[PDB]
């Protein structure tokens, strides 16, 4: 439980102290990426800047482990998360709140929270997941072709470029899991491993405010490595980081962030995925993000040439 015991470590909060200088903010080496392998109108269309100005680490023991800090276009955060917390968890994807509450009490989330935050408890601050394209049977620990919902446009252009980068243009958009943080939420030990294609790579974006993450080998017995995910980060766990045990022992708060500081621009591109949000929405994501972190994880299910078999 060497894990668990830097979990418990960690999780005694410690802010500025020893502990937030044991982390690795952005051993450490530069990961070359390609700056070929996208172009800067389909990274403006998705909101991220030129990969020529993208920075990239690897750490010794753990090859493959991409860690990108924010490469997104100032001002793109904003969309992105709005798209999390507004359109990706009513009816047609799934997320928790599905279980013991009706469509239609969660189909007035956005509205009534809206409600909430101009009178001055909501749903909003009770979401914990959301799952896109192939929904993840928690119970089950399965995928099935029989649940199913379409993956998010713009959402998979973003991965299939950051894939594309990173050294995989072969990556379709399969499976997705929104994680959404309180300030207290954790995300547990354990390895990514639900998937039929491992050599796909796992993709994840961090926003909301800063966490810790960690980084241990197959085995949960190799002790972690810790390190910072700040707003727009990006992890791409490929190779040997995919059987890797990871978790997130905090949401560090505000000792929201400059990211989110920095707005949209009114000009965006004609085919830009990136779209516009009224005030309102970032608003409520403002706030609810002053409170607490996202996570978006991206994930290929099935190999090109594979399927779901029959038995
Ligand atoms: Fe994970």
């Known amino acids: ?50 990969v020529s100005k993208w920075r990239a ?31 990706y968890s009513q009816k047609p994807n799934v997320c928790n ?35 896109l394209g192939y929904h993840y049977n928690w119970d089950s620990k399965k995928y099935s072709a029989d649940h199913y919902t379409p993956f998010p446009s713009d959402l998979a252009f973003l991965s299939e470029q950051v894939a594309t980068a990173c050294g995989f243009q072969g990556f379709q ?9 309180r300030l207290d939420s954790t995300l547990g030990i354990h390895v990514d491993r639900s998937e039929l294609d491992h050599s796909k790579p796992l993709l994840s974006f961090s926003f909301g405010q800063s966490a810790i993450f960690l980084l241990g080998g197959l ?30 022992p905090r949401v560090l708060p505000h000792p929201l962030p400059h990211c989110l500081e920095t707005p949209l621009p009114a000009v965006l591109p004609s085919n830009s995925l990136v779209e516009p949000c009224s005030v309102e929405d970032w ?20 190999a090109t040439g594979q399927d779901f078999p029959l038995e």
């Open 57 to 87: 680490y690897g750490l010794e023991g753990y090859p493959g482990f991409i860690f990108i800090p924010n490469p997104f276009l100032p001002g793109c955060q904003r969309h992105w998360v709005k798209q999390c917390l507004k359109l």
């Open 173 to 181: 958009a399969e499976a997705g899991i929104l994680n959404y943080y």
């Open 97 to 131: 709140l599905d279980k013991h509450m009706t469509k239609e009490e969660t189909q007035g989330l956005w509205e009534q929270s809206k409600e909430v935050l101009r009178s001055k408890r909501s749903l909003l601050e009770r979401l914990r997941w959301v799952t």
């Open 219 to 248: 085995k949960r017995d190799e002790a972690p490595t810790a390190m910072f995910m700040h707003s727009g980060d990006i992890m791409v766990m490929s190779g040997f980081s995919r059987l890797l045990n990871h978790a997130v």
């Open 283 to 302: 608003q409520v994501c403002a706030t609810y993000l002053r409170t607490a972190r996202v996570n978006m994880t991206v994930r290929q299910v099935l």
């Open 1 to 50: 439980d060497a894990f668990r015991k830097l979990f418990r470590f960690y999780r005694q909060s410690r802010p500025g102290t020893a502990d937030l200088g044991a982390v690795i903010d952005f051993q450490v080496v530069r990961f070359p990426l390609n700056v070929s392998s996208v172009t800067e109108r389909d990274a403006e269309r998705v909101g991220l800047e030129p």
